[PDB]
A paper describes a structure:
Once inside the cell the terminal glycine is cleaved by a dipeptidase (PepA) to release Cys-3M3SH (2), which is metabolised by a C-S β-lyase liberating volatile 3M3SH (3), which diffuses or is exported out of the cell (4). While the PatB enzymes are poorly characterised and the genes are not associated with amino acid metabolism gene clusters or operons, the orthologues from B. subtilis (PatB) and Escherichia coli (MalY) are known to have cystathionine β-lyase activity, suggesting that these enzymes might also be capable of Cys-3M3SH cleavage. ShPatB and BsPatB are homodimeric with each subunit containing a PLP moiety covalently bound to a conserved lysine residue in the catalytic site (Lys246 and Lys234 in ShPatB and BsPatB, respectively) in what is termed the internal aldimine state. In the course of a typical PLP-DE catalysed reaction, upon substrate binding, the ε-amino group of the amino acid substrate displaces the lysine residue from the PLP to form an external aldimine.
In this study, we identify PatB in S. hominis as the C-S lyase responsible for thioalcohol liberation from Cys-3M3SH. In particular, ShPatB exhibits selectivity towards Cys-3M3SH with a catalytic efficiency 138-fold higher that that towards cystathionine (766 M−1 min−1 and 5.53 M−1 min−1, respectively). Absorption spectra indicate the presence of PLP (410 nm) covalently bound to ShPatB. ShPatB is a PLP-DE, with a core active site that is structurally conserved across all C-S lyases; however, ShPatB contains a hydrophobic pocket comprising unique residues not found in any other PatB enzymes other than malodour producing staphylococci. This hydrophobic pocket in ShPatB is essential for Cys-3M3SH selectivity. The introduction of a Tyr25Ala substitution resulted in a sixfold increase in KM, significantly affecting Cys-3M3SH binding compared to wild-type ShPatB. ShPatB clearly prefers branched aliphatic side chains followed by linear hydrophobic side groups while excluding linear charged ligands. In contrast to the roles of other MalY-type PatB enzymes as redundant MetC replacements in sulphur-containing amino acid metabolism, ShPatB is selective for aliphatic cysteine-S-conjugates only, while discriminating against polar ligands such as cystathionine.
Numbering used by the authors:
A (entry chain C): -1 to 4
B (entry chain A): 3 to 22, 40 to 402
C (entry chain B): -3 to 27, 40 to 399
């Protein structure tokens, strides 16, 4: 889960 | 330097490879090598054999960093104001908590880098969106919208990307001065995230927000070499806090120790990195020139403008989505139908419908293969 | 395993021009010098660890990294199983950028504004700092001391946990600065108090692989396996002299707290820190044993030197750590010193140690001496300490 994502 | 080199990224715990054969044009790190001047600075630090507790002592690091900002943008700042975080998002999460109370709001222009919002979410801070406007082809700030929201709502903080992700805008002095004036009149803090500031097209010049608006101490600047030198893994970022109270909170409440390999790598980039960086930017420019010609010829209904900064292409595929009534994520669509990983609109908060972001910090031959596959998937069963 | 190599812990390694806190930073932290203060080693980080970092650099790209797959977990859990009979599930393992950073976040998640934390004293100073940073009030339980052999005052702990609003206990196992390797019985006794009063326990086990020959480490969560409010923190930062790489293991067995952690620790690891730590777990056992043997000999020498040269000092060779805890009460009284002992030894002896001021409470008259240094360096420092104290 890349912290750039959501 | 050989930016064409294919560098194997398997078996490196890289998010870019493991986080989702496939062509990778998504997560914002490069497929280009971290330059040897940086890697060699790390290697000579290892030869001193001890990797103990470290902090930035003395003024050598400061001298290297401010020499870079002075030479490149004519921007200087005081050593007292320079503090460090473990990456820019870690910095933002901390700054937002210090600046904002629970009923304060933050303003972001949209579309936006997702973690601007996430940093507000984690501190239980509500975000207000001000959508950028697209009317000349390049994106622009809607100052009327910004003024309205700042005046009428309880906006404590604006988190701003200079240059912008994902649109690539390199804001002019006038754009910045105008926005700064709005923020100053309404006592709004501004965090200017300038991580893309050295990745830009030959004909563009970066102005730091704190250069454009030099007499407002609530402008906080964040800069790193993580994007420009492909050292995001080393998690070391600069934060320039000109406000004495916040600086004191940071110095008091901020628990901070540094990674010696991260510090030496970043320092080396500032001291010796300029030649490699200029060469990387020239190669990037050529990737963008190819991409612009390719979209014009092969995907004419796509809307695209070469971004002034970043290695990220923002492409409007609204036409193709509507003509095909594509009802899944465009990231899923391209993974299934093209074998290419991109970032879809879902990563950019708001004002992003129908867009993808393509990372073209990759060997040109990789980019071309990816673009061909994207095109084939979109024009399948279209006239 | 690395047992066949011949290591040289006598090697003098220059630490100037490395931004080392140990060399540059004593004034800010405490307030030609011989450095025996902050807990990093003067021994080199072992070549098996440094070579793992070099091999990662040869991969050319230092981008966004996380711990993917099972290989890291397998190496770590293989270590804890082999050495302490301690197993945990991969899902319970999360990561922090150093244990104190982890502690700061854990304290905030577990404690509400009105809740108190308990620490046994003397203590590692950042346990208290982590409560202060969260505006969490601390209650001290003074350890019982018999000539350098410290024990928990279980009646005091029970009384405090019962009559104060104690939500959390932060605990060093093995203990800094006293060096105690807690027995199963001691940990089980403390565990029963915590379970009976719904108190969380964070067990900081960063010293657990630095100990005298014949000592066995028992993880708190091994001693008390039934209770999911025991959190374990472990690292290779002390044992392998890689504190600057800021990578730590946190084992959270409580679902609610794990889910909370996982909402604020949105990954992002340092590839160099991860490969270095993994290399220690996979390949570092032989070097670590050699290191501990050399340390044991440093302690044997220090014990002899204090008995002969400073016979009014109280010192027991600790069961763990590379830290000597020395009671200098007699000499402090005689010489009538009323400045911090760290100031006194810098000014008078050119030696940097940690004084009572760094250990929160119940530390009067003590200093902590870091002896993870070449024997010859330790001998020099001790000579200067002695000269400053005697008549
Ligand atoms: C890529 C990017 C970052 C990177 O943040 P880290 O936390 O350092 O990974 C930060 N800000 C912006 C605007 C970006 O585009
Ligand atoms: C030295 C020490 C630490 C160091 O933790 P980091 O934050 O990883 O540097 C933690 N706990 C104890 C008990 C220590 O003695």
């Amino acid at each position: 889960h890349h912290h750039h994502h959501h | 330097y050989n930016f064409d080199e294919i560098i194997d990224r398997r078996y490196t715990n890289a998010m870019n490879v493991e986080g989702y054969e496939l062509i990778r044009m998504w997560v914002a790190d490069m497929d280009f090598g971290t330059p040897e001047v940086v890697l060699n600075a790390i290697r000579e630090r290892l030869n001193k054999k001890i990797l103990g507790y470290t902090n930035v002592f003395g003024s050598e690091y400061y001298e290297a960093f401010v020499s870079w900002t002075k030479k490149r943008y004519g921007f200087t700042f005081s050593q007292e104001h320079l503090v460090f975080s473990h990456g820019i998002v870690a910095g933002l999460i901390e700054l937002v908590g210090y600046i904002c109370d629970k009923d304060d709001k933050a303003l972001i222009v949209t579309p936006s880098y997702g973690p601007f919002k996430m940093a507000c979410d984690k501190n239980h801070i509500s975000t207000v969106y001000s959508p950028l406007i697209n009317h000349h082809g390049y994106y622009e700030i809607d100052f009327d919208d910004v003024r309205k929201k700042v005046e009428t709502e309880n906006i404590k903080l604006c988190i701003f990307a200079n240059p912008h992700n994902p649109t690539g805008r390199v804001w002019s002095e006038e754009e910045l001065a105008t926005l700064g004036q709005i923020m100053k009149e309404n006592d709004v803090w501004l965090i200017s995230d300038e991580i893309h500031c050295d990745i830009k097209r030959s004909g563009q010049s970066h102005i730091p927000f704190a250069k454009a608006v030099p007499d407002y101490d609530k402008i906080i600047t964040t800069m790193s070499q993580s994007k420009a030198f492909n050292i995001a893994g080393l998690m070391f970022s600069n934060i320039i806090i000109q406000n004495e109270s916040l600086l004191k909170t940071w110095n008091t409440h901020h628990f901070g120790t540094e990674n010696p390999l991260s510090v030496v790598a970043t320092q080396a980039a500032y001291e010796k990195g300029e030649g490699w960086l200029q060469a990387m930017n020239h190669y990037l420019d050529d990737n963008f020139n190819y991409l612009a010609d390719f979209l014009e010829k092969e995907l004419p209904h796509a809307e695209f403008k070469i971004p002034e900064a970043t290695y990220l292409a923002w492409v409007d595929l609204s036409y193709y989505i509507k003509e095909k009534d594509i009802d899944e994520s465009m990231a899923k669509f391209f993974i299934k139908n093209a074998g290419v990983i991109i970032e879809g609109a879902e990563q950019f908060v708001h004002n992003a419908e129908g867009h993808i972001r393509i990372n073209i910090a990759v060997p040109r031959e990789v980019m071309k293969k990816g673009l061909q596959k994207i095109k084939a998937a979109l024009v399948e069963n279209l006239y």
